[PDB]
Design a protein around this ligand. Structure first.
Ligand code: CL
Length: 589
């Protein structure tokens, strides 16, 4: 049966991919997003040296990097701009990730709490937050400054990553940051699923964050020789002699499947089972254990109640290590061997070949790739493995290394089944089992839009306009779009409302608002009785309600949709202000 935990929303920010849609495009095109160290971060010429193991140097100069990790919208989160400057970028980016995930799920803060609270006991929490992270590097800058100047305070609390989200969301569930290194994100998901199953909270936000903000990490992988000579993760490829670090922030909104189905939530997939263990005493602290990996994979399978023969795809750890890669396959082989003797039926690959080793966030990026493959029914290439690692025999294995884009066909009406592994360098292992889900036309709707100020509002109109021009959208989607923007967004200061019945009309109105030109009739803008107006709107006269709402009137939009409720759909998230904050702000040179 499984623990039946539904995924009702997701957000992701990965190298070369500001959002999940872009991430899929990169994955589909087999794009390599690895680059050299951005000059803005630090002067890497002070540390680079091609000779392995040189003291005070590093032979790696590559990485999977995000763009503008110092960009943040503190006013949006009720954080003072002064506080933002000394606040760990990981906390900042996870805050923005958390919000985007709620918007993808089609939930406002208040709505999410209400939906969660109804499913658990009185004194049980509503929303839980489980974050995975392993580095506190921002802290180091403050110390480097304080020694040769005036002492500056730069906090290094990993708990803040989860705690600030809980604070912002007004969440009352468990608020936990976990560190199991590379397996952190998957460990967070594991604990989140356990909390939901146990009834500790109604919904749970689970994810991971990992940034490369300091050169120290590179001096470390250089000394320990963990870094690859070519700055690539050759997942199961020949010549892989280490990994390349990558940046990333991701999260999922988790919920018991029954509750999601009953609430008409989007369902991006279902977590059937999770498992967590440790490699024990191997021949070295950072030496992986194939038997432990096999055990955690089987444990997740048993908890999921699945038949491993049906597994269509495995998203592997695949860091591109001399010892690690063959060990991982050995672990997987031992796992499958306890159930079937079948060969070459399962696909395998790693996103790390695309975006690098995201470490504490590797699992959430991996989950994204897996869910996206199922969503589009397409298996994506795994890079840097034109010739496979000589130590690995895929011919005598359950697997076939995915090296070309290919269709992932559904067997009958049976859900596509996938597996996801993440193995911490310190020995902590994790495996997650997921499967996908199987389940007023033409009328005038009222499309609503709000943001912090006028500029952000017109920005939202533009991004929504650009989205609704894509091929997937038609006029038949208008009831879903309107519903999502009503009950799935926060009613903010600057507001925009328009009554439309066709999609091209909505696009025109959005374009007008975005460009600040003249608005049509039935459209209302504001830079910043209900019972009567809602009855009117339910009778097909929504203009007085829309105009009143734009003027600032609070509106319980749910009252409008009490035959069948429209579907929540994926719409563009809030356009955060991109102002730069760093610890050197205000400090003398
Ligand atoms: Cl609130």
């Amino acid at each position: 049966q499984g623990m039946a935990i539904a995924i009702v929303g997701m957000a992701g920010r990965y190298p070369g991919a500001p959002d999940l849609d872009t991430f899929w495009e990169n994955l589909l095109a087999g794009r390599d997003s690895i680059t050299e160290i951005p000059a803005g971060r630090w002067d890497h010429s002070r540390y680079y040296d091609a000779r392995r193991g040189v003291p005070g140097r590093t032979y790696s100069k590559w990485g999977g990097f995000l763009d503008g990790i110092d960009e943040f919208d503190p006013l949006f989160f009720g954080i003072s701009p002064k506080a933002a400057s000394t606040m760990d970028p990981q906390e900042r980016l996870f805050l923005q990730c958390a919000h985007t995930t709620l918007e993808d799920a089609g939930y406002s803060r208040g709505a999410l709490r209400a939906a969660a609270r109804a499913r658990v006991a009185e004194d049980a929490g509503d929303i839980g937050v489980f974050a995975g992270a392993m580095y506190s590097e921002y802290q180091l800058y403050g110390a480097e400054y304080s020694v040769r100047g005036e002492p500056v305070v730069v906090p290094g609390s990993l708990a803040s990553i989860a705690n600030r989200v809980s604070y912002f969301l007004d969440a009352s569930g468990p608020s936990v940051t976990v560190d199991t290194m590379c397996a952190s994100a998957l460990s967070a998901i594991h604990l989140a699923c356990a909390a939901l199953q146990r009834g500790e909270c109604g919904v749970a936000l689970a994810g991971g964050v990992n940034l490369s903000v300091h050169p120290g990490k590179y001096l470390m992988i250089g000394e320990g020789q963990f870094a690859s000579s070519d700055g690539r993760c050759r997942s199961f490829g020949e010549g892989g002699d280490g990994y390349v670090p990558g940046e990333g922030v991701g999260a999922v909104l988790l919920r018991p499947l029954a509750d999601a189905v009953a609430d008409g939530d989007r369902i991006l997939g279902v977590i059937r089972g999770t498992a967590v263990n440790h490699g024990g005493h191997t021949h070295g602290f950072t030496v992986p254990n194939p038997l432990a990996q096999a055990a955690v994979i089987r444990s997740a399978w048993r908890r999921a109640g699945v038949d491993p023969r049906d597994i269509g795809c495995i998203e592997a750890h695949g860091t591109g290590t001399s010892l690690g890669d063959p060990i991982e396959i050995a672990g997987l082989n031992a796992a499958f061997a306890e159930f079937t003797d079948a060969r070459n039926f399962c696909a395998i690959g790693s996103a790390k070949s695309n975006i690098g080793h995201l470490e504490s966030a590797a699992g959430i990026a991996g989950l994204a790739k897996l869910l996206l493959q199922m969503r589009h029914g397409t298996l994506v290439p795994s890079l840097h493995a034109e010739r496979v690692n000589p130590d690995i025999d895929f011919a005598d294995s359950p697997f076939v290394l995915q090296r070309e884009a290919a269709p992932w066909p559904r067997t009958g009406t049976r859900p596509r089944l996938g597996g996801l592994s993440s193995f911490g360098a310190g020995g902590s292992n994790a495996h997650v089992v997921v499967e996908d889900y199987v389940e007023h036309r033409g009328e005038t709707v009222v499309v609503v839009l709000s943001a912090f100020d006028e500029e952000r509002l017109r920005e939202s109109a533009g991004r929504l306009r650009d989205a609704l021009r894509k091929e997937r959208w038609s006029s038949a989607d208008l009831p879903d779009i309107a519903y999502t923007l009503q009950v799935g967004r926060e009613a903010m200061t600057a507001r925009f409302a328009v009554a439309v019945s066709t999609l091209p009309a909505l696009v025109d109105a959005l374009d007008a608002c975005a460009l600040g030109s003249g608005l049509p009739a039935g459209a209302y803008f504001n830079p910043g009785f209900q019972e009567t107006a809602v009855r009117w709107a339910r009778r097909g006269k929504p203009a007085p309600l829309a105009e009143a709402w734009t003027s600032g009137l609070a509106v319980d939009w749910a009252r409008l949709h009490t035959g069948p409720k429209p579907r929540k759909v994926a719409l563009p998230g809030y356009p955060f202000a991109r102002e730069r904050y760093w610890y050197t702000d205000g400090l003398p040179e």
